[PDB]
Amino acid sequence: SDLTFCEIILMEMESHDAAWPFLEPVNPRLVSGYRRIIKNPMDFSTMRERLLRGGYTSSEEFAADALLVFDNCQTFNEDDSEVGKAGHIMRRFFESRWEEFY
Numbered sequence: 001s002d003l004t005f006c007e008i009i010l011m012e013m014e015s016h017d018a019a020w021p022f023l024e025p026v027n028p029r030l031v032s033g034y035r036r037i038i039k040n041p042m043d044f045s046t047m048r049e050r051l052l053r054g055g056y057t058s059s060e061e062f063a064a065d066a067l068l069v070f071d072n073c074q075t076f077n078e079d080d081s082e083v084g085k086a087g088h089i090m091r092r093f094f095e096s097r098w099e100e101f102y
């Protein structure tokens with residue numbers, strides 16, 4: 001019930017123009033080296049699956065999961081890569097919205 005704003009963030013991030021790298025889990029078969037570099041994958045649909053089924057005890061580890069998305073993105077992709085550029089936009093969107101609400 002305090003995750004009222006978490007679904008608003010998630011719903012806006014899902015529909016955001018720059019969300020295309022994070023809408024489904026990275027497919028390690030198509031992304032060379034992803035499996036070995038990123039040991040805790042996270043993506044918006046997994047956050048969706050987890051939020052619906054209810055496993056977010058506070059807005060705290062919602063943010064932890066979102067921040068994991070953008071931390072994985074910066075670990076794996078160069079800042080000037082196409083996926084990197086989208087990640088930065090998504091990460092600033094998230095930070096921006098999160099402080100607008102908390």
Ligand SMILES: CCOc1ccc(C(C)=O)cc1NC(=O)c1ccc(OCCN2CCNCC2)c(C(=O)OC)c1
Pocket residue numbers: 020021022026031072073076077083
């Ligand atoms: C090449 C580097 O690939 C990555 C390297 C690193 C990372 C991360 C997150 O670190 C991410 C990615 N790529 C993606 O996520 C990603 C996702 C979807 C894509 O299209 C699927 C089209 N499909 C979508 C749903 N509706 C129907 C059509 C493509 C693509 O077609 O690219 C060729 C790439």
Ligand SMILES: CCOc1ccc(C(C)=O)cc1NC(=O)c1ccc(OCCN2CCNCC2)c(C(=O)OC)c1
Pocket residue numbers: 024025026027028030031
């Ligand atoms: C090259 C690495 O690409 C990825 C890297 C990472 C990831 C993820 C999710 O992690 C995903 C992807 N790509 C996909 O899933 C994916 C799916 C379908 C695709 O075409 C089918 C569509 N069809 C009809 C319309 N016209 C074009 C051809 C293509 C593709 O290559 O289009 C040229 C890619």
